[PDB]
Amino acid sequence: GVFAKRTMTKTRRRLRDLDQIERDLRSPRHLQQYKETKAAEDLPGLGLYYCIECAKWFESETSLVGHRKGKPHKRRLKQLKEGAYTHEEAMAAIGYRIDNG
Amino acid sequence: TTEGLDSAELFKQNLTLAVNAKSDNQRRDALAYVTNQLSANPANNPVGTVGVLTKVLPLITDGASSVRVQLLKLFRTLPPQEVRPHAEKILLYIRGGMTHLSNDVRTDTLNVLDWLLEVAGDEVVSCPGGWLKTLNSFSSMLGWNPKGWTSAPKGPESQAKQIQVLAKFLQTGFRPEE
Amino acid sequence: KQHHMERTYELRGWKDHIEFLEMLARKSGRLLKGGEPDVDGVAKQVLNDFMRGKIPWFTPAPEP
Amino acid sequence: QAAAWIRILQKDHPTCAMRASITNPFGRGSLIDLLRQFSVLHKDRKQISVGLIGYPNVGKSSIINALRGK
RNA sequence: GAAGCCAGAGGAAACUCUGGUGGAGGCUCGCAGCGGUUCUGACGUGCAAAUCGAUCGUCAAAUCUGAGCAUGGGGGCGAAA
RNA sequence: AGGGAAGUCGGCAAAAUAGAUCCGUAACUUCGGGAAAAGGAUUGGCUCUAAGGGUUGGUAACAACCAACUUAGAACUGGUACGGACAGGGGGAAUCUGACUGUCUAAUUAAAACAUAGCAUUGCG
RNA sequence: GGUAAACGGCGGGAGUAACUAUGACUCUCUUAAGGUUAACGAGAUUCCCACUGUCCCUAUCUACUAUCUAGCGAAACCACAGCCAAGGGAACGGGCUUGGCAAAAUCAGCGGGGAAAGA
RNA sequence: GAAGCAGAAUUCGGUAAGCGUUGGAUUGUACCCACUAAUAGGGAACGAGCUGGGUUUAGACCGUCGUGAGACAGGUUA
Ligand SMILES: [Zn+2]
């Protein structure tokens, strides 16, 4: 289930995008900025247990491994396998290109 | 804090609280402390054996069984050569304690009498009233005493202790002399 | 004194008050939504203990 | 430390030591005796009134309860 | 998940631990029933001279309940208002 | 929408939590509890696999026949949602208070009131 | 005489004085208690997280009313009536005086006044 | 309009009610904080709108008083 479905679409309840997660997977700098955004003392397990694919912090290794066998994790893996939707894909869909000379 | 006072004043104060305190636990603690100091050093007795006995002999008929047991421990701690000259007053206190109504204090008084016999037998059996009055008390609290109505005769562990103390008293009185 | 805190709360090794409250929160289960320790509630517990005398403390008398 | 504080305070004013508990009080007899002495001083009046002052949570109502017994 | 019971590992024994079995409790969530906590509740010449809605307490008992009978006013009856 | 008690005497009211499986669960304690403490990970569909049985018949540790519901594991797949409606704990830190279960003012007060076990006293052979 | 887990009450002794009772006055001891509050609760209170139209600050939708029609159809209340301003000694005015003024018959709301609380 | 009123910021006084004069904290019981141009003062009540205290029917508890029924110096709950 989803906690508080009445306000799931509010801006203050927004979750991380797939393109951001893909950039975190490719580059550790972008993930480093996302982690320096949060104060590590207020994270489960002091932020030592993190799933990049789900962009989630977990309390323990047992919790992380239990997450890794679940269908939300496999959905995130399949979405990353298909690829996130980006601006370049939007321009490719509309047949528009950048001319840098 | 009671730390500036010396050991003699501690001894006298704890003896006074052991005699006059209204708390059973406080009397037990005071008696245990004075017994501990008398066990550690017999020389640590500012008031002396006579004063100690004079203060703690009324405590035989106390209702507190733990206080009675600690009083017996004090009596066993107390030096026998100093116990020996004062056998008569102690024997008055054992006679009162045996004549007391409560069976528990009767048994503990028999224990005190056993201590008195094993410490100073000859003074008990030779002092004025130490023989016949003690025999009268024994007969009275065993019910062995010698207008048209007849009277029924007057637990087990108490009677066994009574007969054992009587047997030891008779053995002490008729012990073979060399 | 530090050993009084260690005996009272059965915890040791903190470097400051923030880490002490965080360790006490994680031990006692004072956790908010998202696994965040409740440092405010734990500090309130420790203050209540301090004024109610569950934590031993005194002011020493001046020397003569 | 308590005895040292009693010495420091008894340099200034008459002081008593107290544990304000209904079940297990300490100093209750001494406080009763002190109030009896003050009543002997003010025997000409029909009664004396003793008011308790101090900070919050020092034990004023607990001292009253310990002296009363209820 | 209480006694009682079974097996295993120890322990000289007594006992200790583990896994079971069992189904106790004026125990607990909760339907009916019984009751009546809260709502700027509905209703206020009302459906009703005390009703209606949501919510709430209890639910294996000091639980709920019928019929027959007993106690009758300077009286009865009252876990007592 | 954004903010999240700034409203109000007062979070009144509403919202939020909710079933089941698994990880885990503090102070205090009359050791019985607290405890569903707290705090977390999951739940659809489809196709499979595995385990848990009965009857009859002279290493039978085997043949034949029959049977229904649970439990665990795996792949694939839709997704904004998977206890998809219904149903369904918000939780925690403290203080006062009555031991608890129970009972009463039908028609304004359900309570620190009453009762209760336990304790003590009195009269009577 | 006895009795305080009866109601109650919270010190004692000595000196002085010597009918009876009182008091006064000194002196002196002046103390029972220091190093299980659980569980349960429609009991009362404060705070924290979450949460939200409680609020900023209101907007919109649905049903049943209210509305109109056909039929049916009361009651409360009622001295007579109902626009105000100033004065009307008894700090009262809807009627009197002096002014403002003032145009049939009506419908839906409304709560200032009158009226309306088994008031 | 006046003032060592240089400028800036003002202070005192005058005509003026046209136009505004806020958001909060604190109930173990009227003052603080901030924004603002400013957070001026009153009347129409205080000579049957709603809602918190004064405030107080019937239940209950503690404190003081009373032999008592009960009352109150009072405090608390519905
Ligand atoms: Zn993941």
mmCIF file of C-alpha atoms and ligand atoms in Angstrom, chain A residues 51 53-54 58 67-68 72-73 76, ligand 1:
data_model
loop_
_atom_site.group_PDB
_atom_site.id
_atom_site.type_symbol
_atom_site.label_atom_id
_atom_site.label_comp_id
_atom_site.label_asym_id
_atom_site.label_seq_id
_atom_site.Cartn_x
_atom_site.Cartn_y
_atom_site.Cartn_z
ATOM 1 C CA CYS A 51 19.390 1.437 -3.043
ATOM 2 C CA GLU A 53 17.722 2.032 -8.299
ATOM 3 C CA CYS A 54 14.832 2.713 -5.908
ATOM 4 C CA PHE A 58 17.138 1.265 4.474
ATOM 5 C CA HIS A 67 13.961 -5.056 -0.749
ATOM 6 C CA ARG A 68 16.072 -6.513 -3.572
ATOM 7 C CA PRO A 72 9.054 -2.698 -6.703
ATOM 8 C CA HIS A 73 12.801 -3.293 -7.068
ATOM 9 C CA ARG A 76 12.638 -0.205 -11.115
HETATM 10 ZN ZN ZN I 1 15.807 -1.344 -5.130
#
